[PDB]
């Protein structure tokens, strides 16, 4: 019922002893506004994160399951998002399900209702272009050690040397946050790589923070919907707490009132036999007992 | 009688006025394997360049009219692209052009229907899947292919870029005549005339259909077998049912006079009703 | 429920089994078995529909391609589709023959009023199920029928609001409509089977071969002496219908009803054939 | 059926209404309401499952994308999915607490004989339905569960013959098996609700709060005096669960047993075999 | 709350209004001219009528001349009707001779209905014409509490 902390298995979950996992959450507390009490997403942070993704991260990765218009009403307006998305092109071969709706036969500017596709046509093309490894899809990247902290830690954390006995082959790099501490991604975030529209200084931690916020925002059950649902949880908890006294009144007080009976027993010696006790009785399961039980 | 939808185009030549012969529609006939082979050859050489068959695969015509290796080579002479795929479910991971395979759907050389319309001057070469629902059925392809001889009447005003055809709707079609003598080079040496090519391609296209096609003659034979079985079972059902009822109804009845002095206290004061709960409190009070 | 006095019979398994074991039927003829013909074809429809439902993806842009592909890659999918269609035809024929026979026999009497209302309710549910199945085809005819039904719903609600959205979303066959209508088709078909069983239980009270009374008091047992006759009569009707269809529907056939079913809801959008044509049972 | 003596209570609408309107319940505590808690969460499960089934297309290559699409374009699909999952968790907790309570109370006499076999059959059907839904999840864990079930089923036939094909096909999550298992999940869930209702009607013969006879003859009417207590106890249980979950499951977390669900069948053909972990109720 | 959720799931939701706004210029268009274009995938007609034709016996006042915007389609069956061929005999397709009376007077012959109107407004003096579909409420319109 108690689990060790120095074996790399956090809280008894085994299988992740080959990487650093607890930095964001257990060993150290990384602050994210959307995961605090009564907190929500930062619109500017999500905006800058989408800018970073569009300018650098989107050249290799994708979010097939999701479309660009997730950012409406929280990060971008329709027109500005329309131009920004139109900066990129799409092809009929990109479509996962190219039904009769997509009647194009060449490249065209993307629209905000398009799924966020990588420049590659297929995962195999991505593998071929990236030296045999596939840039992972970000649709469900929430299921990684420390989630948003996982994204931030992977983006940072290129500042160590492998120990003795560990060899890093060409085309691979050392990253303690990746599985087996050997990743195929070269360091992407350098200082001043992206020029922010709002003039915020562009450093590696800042860009990693922004892109982590954006990617987490796009997620399901943990992004763009969680804060309002936590507020709803608080409202429902308040309702239950306030309704507890009336439930007590009704149920328990009513039972205690109903059980306030007076009982009296008297002697009956009027010469009448208890034939109804001796020759009475009914049982609904008699159709089961008869012929089988107690003969 | 009474089909008032179609009034302009010619419809009844194939079946009603005239009796076109197709082996698959004889009493005990079936498809001609050589005819279907030559028809697929004609479709590959000319027809498949514009029309395509979205709902059908090339691995049709297998075990009949073609073999696996020869069909594989003949379809490998063709080309296919990921943009052609109606639904790529992570199977089609190729990012460029590749040779077609027998398990590939019969796509036109165009990526999209709008692309086909743009290539063909605004008219879409109709998909040959479910083309059996045209006036005459299988005869529609033959009539359309051989219907370029007649002249328009006075004041017809055939538009520029179109052509006159009695069998097409509104008598005007956007397809130039495609079948000419010696257009194809049959593998088996059959002479390549326009009626022969039309016959072969019609046989192939009709063979590709769902309800009427590769399965229909066997279904008709099965219907004949079941009808014969019912005819043979007719006498025994009659025996059992009618003869048994007649035997059961061979009763003898006798009614005598009872004057023993006992009243009918069971006719009076008797009777039970299953719907007494429905009648009670409601009826006859 | 002081205004309710119970049911005619209990639908318990043992009670039903005993009732059908001890049931006795009087001597009859061909014109008094359309009810059992309808029962048998409903059972066949249930089985064939289940086999069909194990293959229909409710995506409207995949239904025609899946129908084409399942036919060539299996041995009985097209046979079960044919059985489903012909079963709908035979269901309509048998139900209307049965209703006509009852109307001719003048069964609008109090002692068989219960057997009438249940029959009409089962018939109305049958119409609803047939409509849903027709919609499930995903052709231009299906779109026309859906538009007609949605417009009738809107006119009933006076054309104010969108009360039809929960069932007919945008009066058109999108996937949201298709999923709901397919599931409704399935469940309502099984409810039809149950209602038919109820009506068949309510029949024995006043059962007659003809309007005129026959004074015979001996009756055959149902399990074999009458079920054999019912099965044989079904064979009779099937053979007659086969002969009629062979002598009346030759192949190939030109200029037919089925020419409006060519277009698909998604594949073909630039073509709509003005001369629409439903099936022969919705033609009235 | 000469070995059948009948049904303890014939299931009719009027009789159900009368029985539930004059049913009385003895004075009890919170430990004797797990059955009604299970009934409530079963009804909620049915409703939320219908809501979810109106959006799940049974295609393994479309399910994750459709689930993502329906979340952003609808207001309550994810709420109903969360309800459905939490209802599964509550069903397991309540059923196990109920079984433990019966075992502790030693309800192993001939009068409790009827209520035991039906309950165990209901538990098996519940576990089968849970397995069907887990397979419908369409992830790597779904594939692992399907493979395990297929292997255990084939062990019955000793690995000879492909007797599993009618349900599992090639032991993978292809479209045919997805359709079959989805429809089976729905139908078996409704049959589960019926079986649970039968088991809960089989309760009134020997109903007790504790193992000690209290000797009290007066008891409360169920419709208001007991239903209100049942609903209030359900609210209190939900409040306790909310407190424990809020203060026990911080977000985000370093590691979770649900990280094995990242892999999607088809999209990801590489499986992380190290972190294979089911839900807690199949963990034993 | 539970019933609200159940009903809202079935009724669906419209997250936002798609953009269909588009502008055209008719400043260089000579009076008494017709122009065919495609807006939102449908062929539409822009016509610059004159006072003399208007007096000949819904309407935009683009300067001295009058401008009408319609959707180029035959309502009884699909067409691209040909204008300016016979004036009152104009607006005719090949399939039927039922004309569309150069205006929205609808009833001319076998063809039923008239060319549907298009929501539009001329916002320059007479030159710039904006067009976009009519907007309808889709409450609830608030996606985020904060």
């Amino acid at each position: 019922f108690i689990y060790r902390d120095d074996i790399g298995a956090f809280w008894g979950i085994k299988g992740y002893e080959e990487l650093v996992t607890e930095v964001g959450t257990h060993k150290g507390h990384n602050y994210w506004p959307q995961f605090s009490f009564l907190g929500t997403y930062d619109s500017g942070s999500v905006r800058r994160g989408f800018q970073v993704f569009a300018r650098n991260c989107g050249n290799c990765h994708g979010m097939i399951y999701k479309k660009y218009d997730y950012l409406l009403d929280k990060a971008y307006r329709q027109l500005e998002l329309a131009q920004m998305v139109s900066d990129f092109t799409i092809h009929p071969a990109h479509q996962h399900f190219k039904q009769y709706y997509y009647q194009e036969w060449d490249e065209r500017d993307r629209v905000i209702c398009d799924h966020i596709y990588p420049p590659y046509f297929s995962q195999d093309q991505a593998k071929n272009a990236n030296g045999g490894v596939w840039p992972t899809d970000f649709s469900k990247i929430k299921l990684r050690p420390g989630g948003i902290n996982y994204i931030y830690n992977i983006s940072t954390g290129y500042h160590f040397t492998p120990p003795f006995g560990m060899d890093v082959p060409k085309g691979k790099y050392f990253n303690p946050y990746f599985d087996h501490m050997i990743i195929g991604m070269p360091r992407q975030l350098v200082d001043g790589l992206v020029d922010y529209d709002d003039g915020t200084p562009a450093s590696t931690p800042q860009m990693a923070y922004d892109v982590s916020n954006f990617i987490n925002f796009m997620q399901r059950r943990v992004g763009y919907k969680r804060p309002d649902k936590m507020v709803r949880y608080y409202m429902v908890f308040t309702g239950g707490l306030l309704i507890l006294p009336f439930k007590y009144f009704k149920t328990k007080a009513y039972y205690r009132n109903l059980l306030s009976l007076r009982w009296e027993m008297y002697a009956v010696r009027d010469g009448v036999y208890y034939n109804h006790f001796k020759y009475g009785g009914y049982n609904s399961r008699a159709y089961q007992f008869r012929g089988y039980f107690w003969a | 009688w009474g089909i008032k939808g179609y009034e302009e185009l010619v419809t009844e030549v194939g079946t009603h006025k005239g009796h076109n012969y197709w082996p698959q529609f004889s009493f005990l006939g079936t498809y001609d394997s050589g005819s279907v082979r030559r028809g697929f050859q004609v479709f590959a050489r000319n027809c498949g360049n514009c029309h395509g068959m979205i709902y059908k695969k090339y691995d049709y015509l297998l075990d009949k009219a073609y073999r696996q290796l020869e069909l594989a080579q003949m379809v490998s002479d063709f080309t296919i692209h990921p943009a052609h795929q109606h639904f790529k479910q992570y199977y089609y991971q190729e990012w460029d052009e590749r040779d077609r395979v027998i398990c590939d759907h019969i796509y036109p050389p165009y990526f999209s229907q709008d692309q086909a319309k743009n290539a063909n001057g605004g008219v879409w070469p109709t998909d040959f899947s479910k083309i059996k629902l045209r006036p005459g059925g299988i005869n529609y392809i033959y009539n359309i292919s051989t219907g370029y001889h007649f002249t328009p009447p006075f004041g017809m005003d055939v538009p520029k870029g179109k052509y006159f055809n009695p069998y097409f709707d509104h008598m005007i079609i956007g397809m130039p005549r495609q079948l000419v003598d010696g257009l194809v080079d049959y593998d088996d040496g059959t002479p390549a005339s326009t009626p022969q090519m039309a016959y072969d391609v019609s046989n192939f296209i009709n063979f590709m259909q769902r309800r009427v096609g590769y399965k229909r003659p066997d279904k008709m034979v099965r219907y004949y077998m079941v009808f014969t079985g019912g005819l043979l079972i007719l006498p025994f059902k009659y025996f059992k049912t009618k003869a048994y009822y007649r035997n059961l109804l061979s009763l003898r009845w006798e009614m005598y006079a009872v004057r023993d002095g006992v009243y009918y206290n069971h006719f009076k004061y008797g009777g039970y009703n299953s719907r007494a709960y429905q009648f009670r409190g409601y009826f006859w009070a | 429920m002081e205004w309710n006095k119970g049911t005619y019979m209990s639908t318990s398994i043992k009670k039903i089994v005993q009732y059908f074991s001890v049931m006795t039927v009087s001597f009859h003829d061909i014109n008094s078995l359309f009810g059992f013909f309808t029962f048998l074809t409903i059972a066949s429809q249930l089985v064939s529909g289940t086999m069909l439902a194990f293959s229909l993806v409710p995506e409207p842009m995949l239904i025609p391609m899946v129908r084409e592909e399942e036919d060539v890659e299996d041995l009985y999918t097209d046979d079960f589709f044919w059985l489903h269609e012909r079963g709908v035809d035979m269901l309509f024929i048998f139900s209307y023959f049965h209703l006509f026979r009852k109307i001719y026999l003048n069964n609008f009497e109090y002692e068989q009023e219960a057997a009438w209302k249940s029959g009409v309710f089962t018939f109305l549910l049958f119409q609803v199920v047939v409509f849903l199945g027709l919609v499930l085809c995903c052709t231009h005819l299906s779109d026309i029928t859906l538009a007609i039904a949605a417009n009738l719903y809107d006119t009933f609600f006076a054309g104010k609001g969108k009360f039809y959205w929960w069932i007919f979303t945008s009066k058109e066959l999108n996937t949201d409509t298709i999923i709901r209508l397919a599931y409704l088709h399935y469940v309502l078909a099984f409810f039809l089977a149950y209602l038919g069983l109820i009506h068949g239980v309510d029949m024995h009270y006043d059962w007659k071969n003809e309007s005129s009374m026959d004074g015979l008091e001996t009756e055959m047992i149902w399990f074999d002496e009458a079920l054999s006759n019912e099965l044989g009569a079904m064979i009779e009707i099937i053979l007659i219908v086969m002969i009629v269809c062979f002598f009346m529907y030759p192949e190939p056939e030109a200029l037919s009803y089925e020419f409006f079913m060519w277009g698909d809801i998604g594949f073909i959008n630039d073509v709509r054939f003005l001369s629409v044509a439903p099936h022969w049972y919705f033609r009235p | 059926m000469e070995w059948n003596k009948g049904t303890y209570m014939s299931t009719s609408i009027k009789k159900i209404v009368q029985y539930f309107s004059v049913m009385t319940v003895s004075f009890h505590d919170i430990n004797s309401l797990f059955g009604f808690f299970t009934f409530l969460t079963i009804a909620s499960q049915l409703v939320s499952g219908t809501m979810l089934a109106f959006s799940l297309v049974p295609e393994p290559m479309l399910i994750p994308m459709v689930r993502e699409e329906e979340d952003v374009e609808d207001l309550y699909t994810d709420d109903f999915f969360w309800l459905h999952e939490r209802g599964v968790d509550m069903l397991f907790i309540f059923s196990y607490f109920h079984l433990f309570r019966k075992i502790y109370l030693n309800n192993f006499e001939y009068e409790q004989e009827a209520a035991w076999k039906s309950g165990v059959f209901t538990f098996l059907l519940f576990q089968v339905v849970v397995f069907l839904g887990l397979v419908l999840c369409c992830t790597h864990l779904s594939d692992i569960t399907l493979a395990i079930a297929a292997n255990l089923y084939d062990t019955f036939f000793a690995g000879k013959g492909k007797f599993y094909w009618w349900i599992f096909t090639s032991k993978e999550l292809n479209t045919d098996t997805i359709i079959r298992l989805a429809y089976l999940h729905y139908v078996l869930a409704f049959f589960l609700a019926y079986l649970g209702l039968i088991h809960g009607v089989d309760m009134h013969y020997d109903w007790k709060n504790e193992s000690s006879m209290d000797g009290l003859e007066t008891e409360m009417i169920w419709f208001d005096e007991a239903l209100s207590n049942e609903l209030g106890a359900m609210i209190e249980i939900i409040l306790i669960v909310m407190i424990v979950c809020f203060f026990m499951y911080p977000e985000p977390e370093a590691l979770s047993y649900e990280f094995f669900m990242w892999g999607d069948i088809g999209f990801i053909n590489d499986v992380r075999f190290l972190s294979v972990a089911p839900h807690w109720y199949f963990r034993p | 709350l539970y019933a609200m959720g159940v009903i809202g799931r079935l009724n669906g939701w419209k997250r936002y209004e798609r953009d269909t706004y588009s502008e055209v210029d008719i400043g260089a268009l000579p009076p008494g001219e017709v122009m065919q274009m495609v807006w939102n995938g449908t062929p539409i007609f822009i016509r610059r009528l004159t006072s003399n034709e208007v007096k000949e016996e819904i309407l935009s006042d683009a300067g001295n001349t009058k401008v009408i915007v319609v959707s180029a389609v035959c309502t009884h069956l699909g067409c691209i009707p040909i204008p300016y061929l016979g004036a009152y005999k104009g607006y005719v397709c090949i399939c039927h001779g039922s004309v569309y009376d150069k205006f929205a007077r609808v009833r001319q012959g076998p063809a039923l209905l008239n060319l549907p109107a298009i929501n539009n407004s001329i916002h320059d003096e007479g030159t710039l014409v904006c067009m976009e579909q009519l907007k309808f409420p889709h409450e609830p319109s608030q996606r985020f509490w904060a």
């Binding site: 039904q99 997509y102 | 709008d114 | 066959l173 | 297309v57 479309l62 699409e69 | 419209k14």
Partner: peptide, 19 residues
């Protein structure tokens, strides 16, 4: 997928080059 009611249901208006 784009075939839903809130999406471009029946693709009456297609996404294409047109021109």
């Amino acid at each position: 997928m784009e075939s839903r009611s809130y999406m471009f249901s029946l693709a009456k208006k297609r996404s294409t080059l047109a021109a």
